[PDB]
């Protein structure tokens, strides 16, 4: 009955990889934002969250039961051992996929990719993100596949904190001669930590505090408490 740790960690990695690839394959249309999985004693569960809460929850429960049956029947899960929990949004420290989807499904119905780039850039820097990069690889004007990368804001690449200031999503938009493949990267905001950004002050910057004004003593002034 006893099992080790490394092997089941890798098996859970398998399960995570398959569930996430299937999720990014299907659910990209209905505006999902943040998806996770959680564990209770002898019980596994999948949780989803978005701005479109009940829309992602689905109509007639078709999505819920259908995908839960899919995972149950594929991953050797005994029946009923998967359920969906609930949550809520803390703040806008993870706001990329809403505008990414907006631009994607504007372009799918007929819209220039760079107009969407303008819009997504301006909304992202109105939201308060520090910097955003959109790399659309492919053919935009002519048959030379230039990797049109649009940056704005600051992007660090070097240091221990740099491990936790990147968010990434991927999508594609369709021309007949070729596909424009859009990777969206966003730098994470230290200031709106929301408990995710490090509470600790930036290493290099010695966070100093404003001194306090007081009267320089000239004659002894004594108070009784």
């Amino acid at each position: 009955v006893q099992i080790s740790k490394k092997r089941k960690f890798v098996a859970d990695g398998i399960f995570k990889a398959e569930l996430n690839e299937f999720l990014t394959r299907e659910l990209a249309e209905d505006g999902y934002s943040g998806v996770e999985v959680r564990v209770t004693p002898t019980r596994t569960e999948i949780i989803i969250l978005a701005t479109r809460t009940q829309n992602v929850l689905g109509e007639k429960g078709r999505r819920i039961r259908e995908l839960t049956a899919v995972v149950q029947k594929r991953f050797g899960f005994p029946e009923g051992s998967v359920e969906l929990y609930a949550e809520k949004v803390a703040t806008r420290g993870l706001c990329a996929i809403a505008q990414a989807e907006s631009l994607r499904y504007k372009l799918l119905g007929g819209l220039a990719v760079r107009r969407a780039c303008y819009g997504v850039l301006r909304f992202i820097m109105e939201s308060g993100a520090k910097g955003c990069e959109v790399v659309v690889s492919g053919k935009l004007r002519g048959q030379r596949a230039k990797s049109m990368k649009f940056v704005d804001g600051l992007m660090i690449h070097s240091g221990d904190p740099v491990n936790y200031y990147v968010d990434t999503a991927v999508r594609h938009v369709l021309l007949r001669q070729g596909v424009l493949g859009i990777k969206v990267k966003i730098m994470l905001p230290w200031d709106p930590t929301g408990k995710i950004g490090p509470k600790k002050p930036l290493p290099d910057h010695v966070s100093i505090v404003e001194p306090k004004d007081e009267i320089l003593p000239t004659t002894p002034i004594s108070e009784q408490k």
Binding site: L111, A112, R114, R115, C117, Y118, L140, R141, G142, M148
Partner: peptide, 30 residues
């Protein structure tokens, strides 16, 4: 379609005049 960056990545191509004309049409439309 956005004239502003159309001009920013087409002014060297075959479509320089059209995107320039559109951008000036956005700026002062009368």
């Amino acid at each position: 379609t956005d004239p502003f960056e159309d001009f920013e990545f087409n002014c060297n191509t075959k479509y320089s005049g059209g995107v320039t004309r559109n951008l000036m049409r956005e700026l002062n439309g009368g």
